[PDB]
């Protein structure tokens, strides 16, 4: 039976305004979650956090964007390492899902030899040809690898059911990034779980008290949040924002899980 | 008389730096609120018209809660109708009102000129009537939602729209800061090309890609619109006029002076 | 309790035949104004809610000049809130208000149920806020332009939207009569499939392609929407309920009777 | 130097409501104009009115649509005949322009052996695959001829300048028909002349006192009329509605012309 | 009863390799022309129906010049009406005709079944009526341009269209080979999922990205549609049936044998 | 001074007929690789610049596997920087580089001119960065994926883009061969209009609708783009220059000769 595990690749250090737009220049620290769904029909990694390379050399691997987001993580938090110690070898992952292709969500890309990588086509196309303000957040070393098998979703694919059994669905949430997608999970005991990811960074974004401090479209972003509100209200899902420092310790992590 | 360009202002706006340059801190910041008059043999043209004259006496009553972000400082004589009357132009003597977009500091002219055709992008007019929560406070329905206003709502294929058909005023569509935002390319007999960026490029910093708009509908569109204006300025050699730049603004002639 | 469908009406509308069947002459014509209640274990659902209860006492004051086309005849007890209270349902006990579209005889419920999420197509909400001259009179801003209404604005890819996730109420997008017009496919335990065409098909004549809507945004869309509903009814075997048909309307059970 | 000639192929008999939507069932009669622009670089026919075949047998050629529009015309009014007596043989026409492909505007189609026929692509595509309510107004015998040379305009072609000299421009006016187009002419002495064609049947449509009694989209139709208002106000053009029975005798017809 | 899938063919087509595998040389090449029958408790379904029976006895007369590209080798008794009659199904007992697209070897069924609703993408029907010169010869108007035919034209948001509403037969939109081309995902009780790629992948080489269609509207759509079907097959474990593969065709069950 | 057009070539490409004329057989075939210089008072313009100079001396090393389709036969001195230097133009004296598209034989100029603004359709640039498997080998990232390069990316509504604003050089959008492919209409004082079709029509057979492109993104776009150019040539009386025609290429003037 399927289970959800919440991991993290350490934290990112930045300023408040990078997360809550225009909220000032104070220091601010957020967890970097990523997810594992163990399913009878194959294992699934979502995003996989920051590249394990960031543990030993952020400036080398990420480059000048470390001026904005400084990652704090240990080697053992790298998604491949974390899965091994958990009992899952790289070859044992059937799918990698990508909410989007920003730097702290492409740690899994190409690190699982048989995994099909599912992302919206327009995120993939934007990641390859970004504008100047967002180029720094796309790490080509992660996602620009010719060996990666991609399933690029189209606009009709909103709601894409990974296994065909309502366990994992893509919920398109454009705004934070062009092809950004959220995920709605249904687990046997827990029921519906809504992973907003970066469609709603924090509880304040969810409550319409802040805007994303980094975004492609504000119009899309706020409409995507209200799309998630309606989905939460309809399903009764448990809502997981993408990075909320206050809410994050209140979820089960680590070896603990949702069934 | 050959066409001329007159730069007016409706006082200033007081906000924070981050409202203009995204994520740039909460320090106090004050900007001029420019608006433009083009006198033309075939009719006088008002662009936007600045903040409603009502803001000179009761900003909180007329704009409401948004004044905690943008406090307008202006005198009553700076209202666009009053300013034009002092300058020599009666309200009925305006043929066109052009709108870059329909935000609160660009709708002081809407409906104040009884014979003017108001030209704005259709998608701006529609968004102004049905904004999202993050922008609703920047659209003052009392300004632009008036039943007897004649509108010419431009369509997507109307980029480059030529007001008089003589190349002297063209709409340059620049989406991003607002969905239907438009800039203007003017051509004047002596000055030559003048590019009014309006809110496509708040400041010289925005033009130089050292800052993002701290109030916008689409970042992707906004950065691409600035590069579209880079190319136009490089092609035409235009004098580039940013929307609000507090340091550049004193370097331009202001009404009663003009650009020939 | 298993879900049920209750058919109410807010009296009738008096117009001409040509307003309903395009170009069919200027004879007097009267139609019922139906609206629908779905009682459901997970929450009660109101569809449209008919003409505003205000029309029972002052139609000219509330609707204005459009009453020379559509005169509403209704009693105050037929207002949707009043009718639901008499039937046993307090205004706070409504989870969803669904809107086929936002025309004047389909917005009596908007904002009258303080806890309801209102579900309508985004493009209908936007058109209602910025209509064209030929349709502006059919949209009553006092009904739908209320600040504290919670809206869930459906997108283009939301065709088939399932309200409870259990197949019992689905939006069937049917553009044409209005830009964001939607029909509804209901599934009930005993009755089975019920297709509420609403204004996609005013009458049996419209359904049979012997008449066009005498008030529409797009004929092309409207005829294709009727054929989309033909296919749905053929696939599902649904009971087909037209929007206003004065001859078919007496043949359905009306509240307090219901479809199980 | 270029000149404009206003011809007509008799009249159509119908009901008021067919022209002014919902205006009642009274009898009503309208002229069917078509246009000739003589230009140094080639002659141009616009639409060409009703098929000459309609003079002798409407029911045979148009079919059941004659229940709605009964054409009253003489053989000699057929655009080919009219041009011959005027001094222009079929081969001497360089372009046929089509506002749209309805029955009373396809009399020229294929009747000029060397003419390129310019129409919006989407009108051509709709004419080939109409819906049930509009099929009767598309006469395939006119426009479905394999020998016809077509230039199908695209959406970017709004404003299409036929000769490249501002003499004749297409002004796209969707609404009455999907690909319906109006024409703005500039003549040396007359100046700007705006042929609305069926974007505004009558002076009442122009003044927003009526809607087209036959249309693909009302939203498009009214916005197309306001597009023409702005164009008339900007240029000072002389406005020619498509069928106005009261205004039609006030224009020059016949051998008379606009220079 | 449970549904069944039967695979028929209307003989073969002779052409060159390059016609099927773009730019692969001028050697002679021969492919079967499959079509499909699904028996279903709620009605019989014919998919495409192969080449018209009329072209068996006079290819040049019914198809014209295109026969210099595709020579159909086919007996009269392989016509889809004749084959079905022999199989036990009179033309009146077919509820739906599904069209992958409207090319000449997929319109033998059109209008031959008097009561059948024909389901195809709207944009294929519209393209078939107004094709470009390179594709015009591939559309046989005598097959599909019949006014007596009942069509259900699917819109762009109808991808995945479920014919009976029970997951047995779904349209899988696969643009590229033709603008409105569609594949089919079937689900059968014993066999499980069956993916009829039809002309989205002519042969196994196409499936494996070693060839492009030698006749096609959009290469970009075509290759992405093949990858869409890859992901569907990998997700479902479907039996993959290419449209024409001569080496694979003998390995499937053909009527009178079936898939249950 | 008046503008002039000079026609250069970077040698030839060897391939098969079918590569240029779809499905026309596997015989050997050889085509020139033209590129263009326009001298203009306001600056020099290079169009495409042919095959990269790097591939003259090591084709497999710079182009990789695609050389098994296109073998470039080219001397180092035919590289566009070397040719221009010999002609009298240092790389710093080129104001604009225009790209018909970003295929391997049209990106020899990219980033070789330090001060040049590169003008290409946005959708060609985006496709070149994320191409499909069938086209990936045709895009040489070492040519166009250089961060030092100044791009002006044209939007969909930029068809007809006038480089100097004086009708000398205009982009004529011709999708099909590549998604963002563009042709060029030049106007020169003595010669008059010159239509550079580039890869919208490889050869005269393509122009005459006797062949399809053997490499292409959309056949439908391709054939309609050829007809768009037909109507432009018929309207303007332009000299029509196909992209590669081996029989027509010797009949044009080549550098050092020019068109005035
Ligand atoms: Mg355009
Ligand atoms: Mg959809
Ligand atoms: Ni992100
Ligand atoms: Ni993030
Ligand atoms: Ni603004
Ligand atoms: Ni402003
Ligand atoms: Ni209605
Ligand atoms: Ni109604
Ligand atoms: Ni007409
Ligand atoms: Ni007409
Ligand atoms: Ni085919
Ligand atoms: Ni086939
Ligand atoms: Ni090429
Ligand atoms: Ni080439």
From TrEMBL, chains A, D:
SMART domains: Lactamase_B (SM00849). The keyword S-adenosyl-L-methionine does not apply. Its EC number is 3.1.1.81. Residues 31-243 form the Metallo-beta-lactamase domain. Gene3D superfamilies: Ribonuclease Z/Hydroxyacylglutathione hydrolase-like. Pfam families: Lactamase_B (PF00753). Its cofactor is Zn(2+). GO terms for molecular function: acyl-L-homoserine-lactone lactonohydrolase activity; metal ion binding. Belongs to the metallo-beta-lactamase superfamily. This is N-acylhomoserine lactonase. It comes from Salinicola salarius.
């Amino acid at each position: 039976a399927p289970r959800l595990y919440m991991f993290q690749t350490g934290t990112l250090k930045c300023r408040v305004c990078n997360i809550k737009m225009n909220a000032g220049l104070d220091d601010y620290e957020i967890p970097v979650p990523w997810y594992l769904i163990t399913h009878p029909k194959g294992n699934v990694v979502i995003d996989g956090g920051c590249a394990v390379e960031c543990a030993s050399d952020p400036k080398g691997y990420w480059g000048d964007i470390t001026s904005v987001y400084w990652p704090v993580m240990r080697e053992e938090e790298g998604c491949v390492q974390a899965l091994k110690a958990f009992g899952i070898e790289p070859a044992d992952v059937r799918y990698v899902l990508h909410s989007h292709l920003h730097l702290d969500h492409t740690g899994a890309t190409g690190r699982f030899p048989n995994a099909i990588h599912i992302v919206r086509r327009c995120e993939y196309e934007y990641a390859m040809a970004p504008d100047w303000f967002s180029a720094g957040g796309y790490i080509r070393a992660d996602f620009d690898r010719p060996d990666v098998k991609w399933h690029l979703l189209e606009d009709h694919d909103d709601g894409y059911d990974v296994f065909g059994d309502d366990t994992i669905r893509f919920i398109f949430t454009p705004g934070h990034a062009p092809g950004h997608s959220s995920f709605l999970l249904r687990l046997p005991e827990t029921g519906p779980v809504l992973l907003a990811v970066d469609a709603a960074y924090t509880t304040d974004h969810w409550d319409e008290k802040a805007l994303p401090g980094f975004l492609a479209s504000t119009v899309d972003a706020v409409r995507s949040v209200r799309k998630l509100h309606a989905l939460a209200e309809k399903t009764g899902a448990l809502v997981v924002t993408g990075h909320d420092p206050e809410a994050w310790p209140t979820f089960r992590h680590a070896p603990e899980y949702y069934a």
